[PDB]
Subunit: 175 residues, 6 copies
C-alpha cells in the first residue's frame, strides 16, 4: 500500500512524493490515513481557493506538525490522488501553522520522468508568480477556519529544502 512507499531512491536529492490533492482541483483537502493507507477527507475548505500545485508528502518523514513533510509538485497536468511521483527538491517555503512548524517543500518531476523541469535548479528558477501565489495560498486558505492559522517565514533555497528533508526523515526514524 502507500504506507510502504520509500521516502526516496536517494534522499534528499531523489525523493518520492505521495500526492493527496491534485493541481487545478476542487477545494477538498485529503490526507492519507496512517492506519489504513486510504485517502480520507480532512476538510472541505471554506475559502474559494485551490492548492496551487499538486500537494502531498514524503513517506517515512515527520514535521513538527505531527504529519509527514509536505511537498508541492508542479506538473504540466494534474496528478491522481494517491499516486506517487519521483521528484527532486528545488526550494522550500518556511512557515508554521496552528499544529506546528510546517514547511512546504517544492520538488519538481525527476529528469527520468520528464526533461521539462531540468532547468529548475534552485529556488530562484521557480517563477516569481508561482512562489507568490503559493505563499498567498497558505497565508489565506484557513482565513474562515476558526483557530487555524498560518505564519509564513519565507522562501529558501534547494540546500535548505534538502536539509528539511533530512531533518524530517530523522524525526520519523527517531520517534
Amino acid at each position: 500500500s502507500l504506507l510502504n512507499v520509500p521516502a526516496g531512491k536517494d534522499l534528499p536529492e531523489d525523493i518520492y512524493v505521495v500526492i493527496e490533492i491534485p493541481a487545478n482541483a476542487d477545494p477538498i483537502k485529503y490526507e492519507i490515513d496512517k492506519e489504513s493507507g486510504a485517502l480520507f477527507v480532512d476538510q472541505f475548505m471554506s475559502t474559494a481557493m485551490f492548492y496551487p500545485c499538486n500537494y502531498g508528502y514524503i513517506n517515512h518523514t515527520l514535521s513538527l506538525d505531527g504529519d509527514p513533510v509536505d511537498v508541492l509538485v508542479p506538473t504540466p497536468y494534474p496528478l491522481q490522488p494517491g499516486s506517487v511521483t519521483r521528484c527532486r527538491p528545488v526550494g522550500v517555503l518556511k512557515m508554521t501553522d496552528e499544529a506546528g512548524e510546517d514547511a512546504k517543500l517544492v520538488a519538481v518531476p525527476h529528469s527520468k520522468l520528464s526533461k521539462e523541469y531540468d532547468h529548475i535548479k534552485d529556488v530562484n528558477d521557480l517563477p516569481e508568480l508561482l512562489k507568490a501565489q503559493i505563499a498567498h495560498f497558505f497565508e489565506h486558505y484557513k482565513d474562515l477556519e476558526k483557530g487555524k492559522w498560518v505564519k509564513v517565514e519565507g522562501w529558501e533555497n534547494a540546500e535548505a529544502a534538502k536539509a528539511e528533508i533530512v531533518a524530517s526523515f530523522e524525526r520519523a526514524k527517531n520517534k
Copy 2:
C-alpha cells in the same frame, strides 16, 4: 487498505463512508471488492442517469442484499472514488431491489470536516428536490437492465437511519 477502515468513530451517529461513485459523475457503477479491496466496475449503466450524490457504503456492515449498507453523501464538490469521509446520518430512503432489502442512507459531512451541513439535523431539512431526485434515480436507473428492479417504500428520519446502521453492523458482526 479500505477493507480495514472502521464503520465509524462512534456508530451510529459518527460514521465513515467509503465512496465508490462520485457525485456529478459518468454513469459507471463501481464496487469495492471484498477480497482485494480494489474498485471494480460493477455495471456500465444503460440509462442516461447519474448518481445524485456521492455514493458508497459503511464498512463492516451488511444489508439484506448481501452488500454493506449504502450511503449517499451530499458535498459541495465531488469526492474521489475510494476515499473515505466522516459523516453523520440524517435520513434514509427505504427500498428493496432484486437482491433484497436495500436502504439508502443519507449522511452529511461531519462538523469537523465542514460547518456547511450542520443545519441539516433531520430528513425534513434535506431539500425536497434532492429527496425527490434521489427516489426517482433509484426507481429508474435499472429500467433497461432485465431482471433488475427497485421498489421504493419512502423516506424516513434520522432515528430510522441510525436504527438501520445499527441493524446492518449487527448483521455483519453476526454472519
Copy 3:
C-alpha cells in the same frame, strides 16, 4: 447578440444575467466587450482563487466603476460563459474597488427555471458560509495585482439589491 439582451422582463424583481465566468472554474476573469459583444480575457488571476458562484452582469446597467452592475448567481451546476439566466435578486454585497463603487448582487434562478431557490427570499436565507466565502473572495483575489484593491462595506437585503438594480439601470439610461 448579447448586446441586445434586456436588463429583465420586469426589473428589479425579474432580471436577466449575462454570465462571464462559470462557477467552479479556472482563475480567468472574462468580460463581454461592449463593442463587439465577444468575451475577452480581462485578467489571468494571480491568486489561487476562483469565483464562488457564476459571475456576470445585468445588461443596460452601469455601476460607478464604469461597467454594468455585477451579479453572482448560485446554480446546481456551472453555467456556460456567454449564456443568459433569468433570476431574482435576494441580496447584495456592498463594496468598492479601485475603479469605483462596485456592488455585487446575488440573484438566484427564477422559479420558472427551477424550484430549487424559491425558498431563498432574502439575504438571511443565503448560507452564511457562502456569504463569507464571497466576501473573502472579493477581499483577496486582487492581493497580488498592484494598484488593484477592494473595500467591502457589507451584506444588505433584497430591497437594497433591488434599489441597486434600479439605480444602475437609471445610470445607463442617463449617461
Copy 4:
C-alpha cells in the same frame, strides 16, 4: 450570428445542426433565443438525467411545439454549446410533449467532418442500446416537472427523418 446559419447545404440529406446542449453534460437545458441569438437557460432539470447525445436544432425550421426541429448528434467527444455541425439524418424518434408534436431527429457527423459514422446509413445501424437510452431519457426527464410530459410513438427510418426535416422547413417558411 447563429440566427443566420442555413438549415443546410442541401436539405434534407445535408444539414447544419446548432448545438444547445453537449453530450456528457450537466443537467441544464439551454435554448437559443430567437431574438438575440444568445444561449438562455431554459430549465435546471429536476431529474438526475443527462442528454444522451449532443442536442440542438436545425435553423429555419419549426415543429408543432413551436420551436425549431430537434436533433441528437452522436460524436466521439462532446460539442461546444452554440457551435454548428454539418450532419446527415439517419433516423427519428417520433414523440409528443406538452407543447406539441416534437420529433427528435438523429443525425450523424457528415463524411466531410469524419469517416466515423459513414457506416450508419439508416436507423437500424444505430446501436440498440443508444436508441433505447434516448427513448428512456425523453420518457422520464420531465417526471418531476408538473404539467410537463412526453408520449413516445417510436423509432422511424432515415426516409421518415428526411420527411420530418422537409415538413419542418416548410412550416417555418410558411408561418
Copy 5:
C-alpha cells in the same frame, strides 16, 4: 491490494484488466508498482498525444518487455485509474518497443457489465478508425523520447489475442 487481483475468472476468454491510464486523459503514463501496489508516474509524455482507450494490464502475466501484458479497453466513459474491469479479448496489436516484444491486447467490457460490446466478436468488428488511431498512437507517442521507439507488426484476431494471454500467464508462472 491490486497486487492480489486474479488474471481472470476463466483465462483467456474471461479476464480482469487493471487500469493505469483512463481514456480521454491527460498525457501522463502511470504504472502500478509491483512492490507497493501504488500507481507511480512513469513518464510525462513529450508528444501531444493521448492513450486512445483506457490502458492497463492483466495481473499475473509477463510480456517480454518485462511488465504484465498490456490491454486497451474501450468504454463509453473513462475508467478510474487503479480500478479493475472484467473483459473479453477481441484482438491484438502485435508490436515491439525498446524494452522488448510488447503486444497490445484489445479487450471489451464483459457482457455481465454491459451489452454494449457483445456485438464485437473479433478484430474485424472493431472500428477501422479506432484500430488505425491505436496503431498511430503507439507508432508516434515516443517520437520525442530519445532511445525509446516502437515497431508495429500489425493487427491480429481474437484467437491470436487469447494465445498471447496464455503465453503471458505462463511466462509469469514460470519466471
Copy 6:
C-alpha cells in the same frame, strides 16, 4: 460579433487572438465561419492528438491557405472557444499544408492581462519541449486524413513573426 474584432490595438506587437480550440481539449478542430461568425466543426481529428496550446487566429488577416493567420497562445489554464485574448508575438513556426503556406504564430498573453509571460521576449525563451511538441503535432495530426499533409520549415524569431503578421494583414486588406 467576432467578425468585428480588431486585428489588434497596435499591430504587429499588440494583437487580438480569436480562440477556436482550447488548450488541453478534445480532438475537435473548430473554425469560425466568416459568414455567420459562429463556431463550426471543421474536423473530428482522426489521430489521438490534441492542440498543444490554445489555437485560433488574428481577425482581418489572410494566410496563403485562404484563412486568417493562425496563432498558438500558451496560457496557465485553457481559454473558452470564441473568446478573444490580447497577446504579443514571440515566434513563428514556418510551415505549409495542403491548402498553402500556413505559418503558426506563437503569441503570449499581453502584460496587461498577466505578468506571467513578460519574460518570454523571443523564440529562444519558449521552452524547447513546447516548441518540439508543437512541431510534432503539426507534422502528425493529419497522418490519417487522406490528401492532407504538412511540411514544417522551422522555428523563427519574434521579428519574423511580426513580419508574418504585417504580411497577413496586408493580404486581407488587399484581396
